[PDB]
Structure 1
């Protein structure tokens, strides 16, 4: 299926056109080493800081009218709080909350059945880290159902 998110797996090694807000210093795009850390390809978003941190990773997409689903893949230190949110599509915001549970214990947050009526959507991932927390984010998808 066509994936409507741009640079959805960070495989350029760069964020663009994703935007980072909040504690930008906690988050980078890396060539995964070991490569296990990425869900697909060679690159992933990696976050870490030695003090508590809060950031958002987001991308806006203009879409043909239709019904969509979005998700991504993450793993990280046991206890990191991550949220996936969708907004601005015509209905109220929807979110999913996940906890990472340890290295390579992959989680796949997903929101389905999003009827896009405004011709656009905003995809936002929120990360709330404790001091020393870390994790990886990769392999976004935005598909028309």
Structure 2
């Protein structure tokens, strides 16, 4: 249960060391109100904009060789396109795609059986929304299997 991602729940109230790329103004760390918008703790990433938007959240990690799994938790407006990607670990990029389906309909994208041979991994989440779309991202984990 040791989690290899830093600030995996945004509980500092800030992004660091997660990088935000793309339409940054679409994405914030917020103190969830109601708290149910977060999956753990008090804070979550919330995205929203009044026009269409795309962004990515990423973090790179140095890790012991081993087999790992990565995932997180999300919910939001019906039809927002979210992808989880892992790269730089030794193999080709792996991904999984999910769409949100409404408020508090939690999704748990996950990638398992990731054989880290480079001593590194990069975790990227991509979000693509239409005008007015929104959602929450929280509670990342990178575990050794």
Same fold (TM over 0.5): yes
Distance in structure 1 (CA, Å) of the matches to 2:126 and 2:105: 19
- Post-superposition Cα deviations, 1:22-80, rounded to whole Å, max 9, x if no partner, equal 00000000000000000000000000000000000000000000000000000000000
TM-score with structure 1 setting the length: 1.00
Distance in structure 2 (CA, Å) of the matches to 1:77 and 1:125: 17
Distance in structure 1 (CA, Å) of the matches to 2:22 and 2:118: 27
Q: Runs of 4+ in structure 1 displaced over 3 angstroms?
A: none
Give the CA deviation at 1:13.
Answer: 0.3
Distance in structure 1 (CA, Å) of the matches to 2:9 and 2:95: 21
Distance in structure 1 (CA, Å) of the matches to 2:130 and 2:68: 33
Give the CA deviation at 1:106.
Answer: 0.1
TM-score with structure 2 setting the length: 1.00
Q: Could you tell me which runs of 5 or more consecutive residues in structure 1 were left unpaired when the two chains were aligned.
A: none
Give the CA deviation at 1:94.
Answer: 0.4
Q: What is the root-mean-square deviation of aligned Cα atoms in Å?
A: 0.3
Q: Could you tell me which runs of 5 or more consecutive residues in structure 2 were left unpaired when the two chains were aligned.
A: none
